[PDB]
Amino acid sequence: NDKVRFIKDELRLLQEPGSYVGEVIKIVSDKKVLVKVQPEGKYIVDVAKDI
Amino acid sequence: AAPYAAKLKQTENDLKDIEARIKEKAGVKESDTGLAPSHLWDIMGDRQRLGEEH
Amino acid sequence: NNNSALSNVNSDIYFKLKKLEKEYELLTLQEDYIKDEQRHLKRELKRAQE
């Protein structure tokens, strides 16, 4: 049961929209942060409530 | 060197408090200018925002 | 004491276990079901991997 039902949760994860590797150039204190997605453009964008 | 040495050590603890204040103070920001006239533009701009001609 | 009015100790163990063996048929029923569950789960381990 342990082997078959771990896999079904794992299907969701692999089927992500994609996700990028940026770095924060500088912070804005309205909980937005200037993040240069590194091959792509610069974006000022909000965060999660995990950080 | 206890008479000047001790006292020198307290001076370094002070500086660290200061640097910390610049960080603490910077934490409201919040600097968007557009004033009182542009409170009208935000209604106008919701219609331009769902405009495909921009 | 322990051997005087022994036929009264006899009747309560006999009664109590007789009731429980009906309910202990429902636990072997379960043994039987989970022999099948693993066979259904073995084809579903295959389908999940598929």
Side-chain angles (χ1 to χ4, degrees):
Chain A
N1 184 284
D2 294 338
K3 315 175 190 297
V4 55
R5 295 303 172 194
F6 92 86
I7 309 172
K8 319 292 194 176
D9 317 310
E10 269 209 298
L11 292 165
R12 180 192 54 164
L13 297 175
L14 303 156
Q15 287 182 179
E16 61 164 306
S19 175
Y20 299 132
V21 188
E23 64 189 291
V24 181
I25 316 309
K26 37 175 85 168
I27 58 164
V28 177
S29 302
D30 297 311
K31 209 177 281 184
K32 310 199 167 184
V33 283
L34 173 53
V35 186
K36 188 167 118 48
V37 174
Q38 305 178 8
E40 302 181 48
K42 312 192 68 180
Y43 303 99
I44 296 179
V45 59
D46 64 321
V47 309
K49 320 302 180 292
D50 286 280
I51 40 169
Chain B
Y4 300 87
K7 310 295 194 285
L8 183 61
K9 294 189 250 311
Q10 295 173 287
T11 307
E12 305 311 293
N13 298 58
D14 188 31
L15 277 169
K16 302 281 281 172
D17 178 77
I18 305 191
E19 292 177 42
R21 205 177 68 235
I22 326 182
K23 315 179 179 69
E24 207 74 38
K25 193 70 184 156
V28 176
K29 171 163 72 185
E30 192 72 32
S31 206
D32 194 301
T33 306
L35 315 169
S38 74
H39 291 73
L40 289 166
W41 300 332
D42 200 277
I43 324 168
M44 295 178 187
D46 279 324
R47 298 300 181 277
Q48 309 296 94
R49 170 208 76 188
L50 287 184
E52 321 159 70
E53 65 176 16
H54 291 63
Chain C
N1 179 67
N2 190 67
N3 192 228
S4 285
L6 185 55
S7 56
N8 197 290
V9 188
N10 302 358
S11 47
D12 284 341
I13 311 164
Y14 177 54
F15 264 32
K16 184 171 182 63
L17 272 49
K18 229 196 301 200
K19 286 157 169 76
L20 291 164
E21 85 191 80
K22 184 272 183 170
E23 306 173 62
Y24 287 160
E25 311 189 281
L26 281 168
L27 299 177
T28 56
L29 178 72
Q30 194 197 292
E31 195 165 300
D32 201 48
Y33 173 29
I34 58 199
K35 294 191 74 45
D36 210 34
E37 272 210 294
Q38 58 176 233
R39 276 183 314 203
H40 280 62
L41 283 149
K42 168 176 293 192
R43 303 180 280 206
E44 280 186 295
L45 170 66
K46 317 256 163 72
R47 203 115 66 110
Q49 283 173 330
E50 166 202 91

